[PDB]
Amino acid sequence: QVCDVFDIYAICACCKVESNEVFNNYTFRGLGNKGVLPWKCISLDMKYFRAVTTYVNESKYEKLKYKRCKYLNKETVDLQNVVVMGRTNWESIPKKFKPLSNRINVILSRTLKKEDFDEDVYIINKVEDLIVLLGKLNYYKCFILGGSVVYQEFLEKKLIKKIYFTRINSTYECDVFFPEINENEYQIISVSDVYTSNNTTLDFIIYKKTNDDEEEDDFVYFNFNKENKNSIHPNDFQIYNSLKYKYHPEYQYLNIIYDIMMNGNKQSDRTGVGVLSKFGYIMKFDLSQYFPLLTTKKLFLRGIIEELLWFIRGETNGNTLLNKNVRIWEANGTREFLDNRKLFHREVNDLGPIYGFQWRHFGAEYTNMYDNYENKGVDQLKNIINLIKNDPTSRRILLCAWNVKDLDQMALPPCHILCQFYVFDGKLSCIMYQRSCDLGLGVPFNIASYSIFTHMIAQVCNLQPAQFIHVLGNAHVYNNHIDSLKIQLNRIPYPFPTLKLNPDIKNIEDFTISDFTIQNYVHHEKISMDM
Amino acid sequence: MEQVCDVFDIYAICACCKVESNEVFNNYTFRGLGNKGVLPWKCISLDMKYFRAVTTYVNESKYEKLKYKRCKYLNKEKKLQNVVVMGRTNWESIPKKFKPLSNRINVILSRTLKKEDFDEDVYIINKVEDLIVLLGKLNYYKCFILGGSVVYQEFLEKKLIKKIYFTRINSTYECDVFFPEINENEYQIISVSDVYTSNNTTLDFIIYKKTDDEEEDDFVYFNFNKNSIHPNDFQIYNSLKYKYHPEYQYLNIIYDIMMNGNKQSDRTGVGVLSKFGYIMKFDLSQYFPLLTTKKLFLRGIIEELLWFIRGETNGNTLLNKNVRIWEANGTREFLDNRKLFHREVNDLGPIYGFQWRHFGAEYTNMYDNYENKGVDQLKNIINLIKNDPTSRRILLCAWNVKDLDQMALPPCHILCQFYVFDGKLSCIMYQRSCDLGLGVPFNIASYSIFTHMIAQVCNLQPAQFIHVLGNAHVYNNHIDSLKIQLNRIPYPFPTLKLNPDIKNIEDFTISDFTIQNYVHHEKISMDM
């Protein structure tokens, strides 16, 4: 209750530490090294630090000072925030910075005296002397800045109301570590957008201690005709519904799953499996700040990169993929699947004029997967690259795989109908339109595929990737993914990884598997969607 | 200097239709209150439901503040209910089985009748000032004036109304009593609802106005991290509190492009502000989304759509109907600048109609008979909807990569995808390039009509038209005109009627389409 009275919070920034790894909240625990911060400088976290440790709402202080006085059984107290540091933490701060501007500076030490310090720079000897000092002060909120020992003992005494935790998604050498937060005591309630600052991704999470209104009526009136549809239970998404602010871009995906589960229409499909379906969604991912590889389950990327490279080569030979143990297309190339497609005269694993053929040879007559198609058909891929380089404000930079004439000769019609690209201020955005979206299994791979593809096109055009924009047409959750996706919805995302391409690759056809590196992929446990 | 209507929370609620009398439209278009002592229309049940929800809703936790405020003004220390006030004529028009209005404190204004003339649990008052006295003596949440016209007129005249809850019934009926003309200097629209259909009419609801705190701070922390267009230029648009009318999907995108768009050149050289990736959804079961903040005619785009369905590429066919949509793209100079030197004037090449009916056939000229050449995807999608409704492959594609350079210009409307659930048909159209000022209003109308035509010949009802915008841009020379448009308040949308006898997609003609009850602001020239 003390932490509720005096509004005592922790704020920290933790990196990953040098040692299939297992990831959990304690993965981010690196506080310092050699008396200083483990990283060189992360200025977005510092901006966030100053905004949090200095923000004050005077219009809410009267209620706070009222509550503090009543608790002390006083009527008067005898506007800034309080910041509390350990002595080691106070020493490491450069002299130019000290004392922390517009903050009431409090050092918890056992070898200091106010006689070496200011009148306004307070020193306390034990933790309980802060509760005394706060009772005598006028302050909005009290922030505990560390370090490790200060965090440890404040936390063990349940003196912390909330933990403002920056997750630094890179690994450094550390010799002091944030204490493990007991998830029975504290639970994550808000997660921020993902950012890039100083060559690392980071995000901001909030741990919580566990336990004109004239126009507000008009809101109810305009809701008078509202319906909450399906046999999914609210109590199953407890963690998901308990979160207040879900700004992490992975919630763009997770919110669509929840929407389809709650409001999807029950329908059959070819496999008789049954789906919940909705029609029409857009997701947007900021490739300049992160690589949107889902973190609430484990995803593998080798297969889909090879598939992309196989596309760019113009290949339609499934064997090429199968010999690399990339089996994305195997079921679509069997004798039985082709026969059921009425492709009686198609060789096994000859998928016909699918993506690769349309990207490099749209309009050419397909014969078989071994034929030579050099200079036959429209080379869309080359054309869009040249439009991007030479006519970047063109509204006609489209790459289309839905060749209406060839659909029946394909093993199956493409789910990814087209990409359209957009260039502004030397930056490349790409929209992909998908007609059919397996949310549980297919869509997570599809976001990665076209996010990688957007990086590749941008690099060979000497542009920076900006946004990948994903338009979902028939968007469905297979009934046999529902249990698994319920598990997934209650996992809290980690800060996204980043993608690195070999910078020397300046032509779209020159990438190989080794030119792609995923960095700092922190993820929850893998999940079998069909359990 | 307090106001009686603010101390005692006095509101008016009403429903108005259009009245029988090349026309101008304004707010006073909706003024029909009653006829022959009863309502002008038979029964519009959705308005009844809205009427009930508003006049019975109370928030108990707010009454404490309300009681204190009224006590202050007056200089003093069962379930809470609203008060409703009716003129005597209004009271007598209500069927007996609904009198007194359930869960409300009923107050009747009369001089010719007194309490002895009433069996029911009601207050009689014989002048407006006795209402104020009564309200000072009662426990109530809010006080709603229900009419009729005489009651409205004097309460408005005396400025005793804090807000008017106003239903716009978008159809015409014979009337003999009318809502008073609202004085725009006195009352302004602050909110507008979604559009609905009920009992074969559209309607919306508009509002006139008299002219754990811990999570509060976390929001501020998470927010710790452009164009020479001016605030005062959107006073009406930004003064609105609730903008739920579906036309705001379009107006908000205009506003978004103006405030955040990227400055770019383009093929025409005009210059644009542009953004990338938008989606609008329109519920065709509830309204036809023909924009009302400016005037639009549909005869041309319907002839165009029928010309598509016939597989035609001959521009002269449209021009002979005085439909000039494609005229500039058919000229010798336009065709030559496309390198189409061997193309006859107004032969548009293998554009939408040819791709819909003959995808993959070699185009020769606009006069050829292409019967049984290429893929008839229009027939195919109709068959899939009828016979394979859960297919995720029901797509109609005009972007034929092979044929693009032979087209007068490449299509903007890349594809249509359809969706069937529970006997209702939805359509997604993806537009690669979207002239928000000129083309998008028409494009919304075209594919909304196309969705109705496909649904009907497949024995389905239309549900959603969904419009995905790719490169969405506003031309610089449209900006001043669009600033005007964004400060207009949409009217309830019209409805679209198809001749129900038409059972095959190819059998429609121009007279099988009717747009009814189009109420709209004045026409705007987007340029100059």
Ligand SMILES: NC(=O)C1=CN([C@@H]2O[C@H](COP(=O)(O)OP(=O)(O)OC[C@H]3O[C@@H](n4cnc5c(N)ncnc54)[C@H](OP(=O)(O)O)[C@@H]3O)[C@@H](O)[C@H]2O)C=CC1
């Ligand atoms: N990235 C981040 O978010 C943060 C990083 N850091 C890093 O952490 C490191 C410092 O943390 P740490 O090394 O744990 O040292 P601290 O910052 O914990 O300060 C330790 C000092 O605090 C005093 N102290 C500790 N417990 C008590 C107590 N119960 N009563 C009275 N005085 C007490 C002692 O002073 P005396 O010696 O007089 O007893 C001790 O020397 C630095 O490398 C710094 O960069 C620090 C804070 C946050």
Ligand SMILES: NC(=O)C1=CN([C@@H]2O[C@H](COP(=O)(O)OP(=O)(O)OC[C@H]3O[C@@H](n4cnc5c(N)ncnc54)[C@H](OP(=O)(O)O)[C@@H]3O)[C@@H](O)[C@H]2O)C=CC1
């Ligand atoms: N569509 C809508 O939203 C509404 C429609 N209507 C329609 O309106 C019509 C009736 O409205 P209208 O004809 O204008 O008659 P009203 O309902 O306005 O009531 C008129 C009567 O109310 C009494 N009255 C009014 N003001 C006072 C006052 N200040 N002091 C004392 N008595 C007063 C008098 O009754 P007496 O003559 O006994 O003194 C007067 O004749 C009907 O057609 C009804 O259906 C009604 C309400 C709203």
Ligand SMILES: CCc1nc(N)nc(N)c1Cc1cccc(-c2ccc(C(=O)O)cc2)c1
């Ligand atoms: C990464 C910091 C941090 N972030 C978050 N979110 N919570 C924290 N408790 C800290 C530690 C901290 C506290 C006070 C000052 C400084 C500091 C001063 C000066 C300098 C400098 O001179 O560079 C750097 C840091 C750090």
Ligand SMILES: CCc1nc(N)nc(N)c1Cc1cccc(-c2ccc(C(=O)O)cc2)c1
């Ligand atoms: C159109 C309603 C209305 N809507 C709005 N938004 N504001 C209004 N002030 C009214 C007038 C009104 C009030 C109370 C009852 C009746 C009524 C009921 C039943 C019948 C009947 O069954 O005939 C007739 C009238 C009308």
Ligand SMILES: O=c1ccn([C@H]2C[C@H](O)[C@@H](COP(=O)(O)O)O2)c(=O)[nH]1
């Ligand atoms: O890259 C892909 C390929 C397939 N699917 C899913 C969508 C459907 O669940 C199924 C394709 O079957 P149809 O929609 O074509 O019937 O595969 C994807 O989500 N992404």
Ligand SMILES: O=c1ccn([C@H]2C[C@H](O)[C@@H](COP(=O)(O)O)O2)c(=O)[nH]1
């Ligand atoms: O039905 C149409 C046809 C054209 N346009 C606009 C979009 C562009 O402003 C211009 C076509 O230019 P390109 O994208 O094709 O360059 O016309 C539309 O909005 N709707």
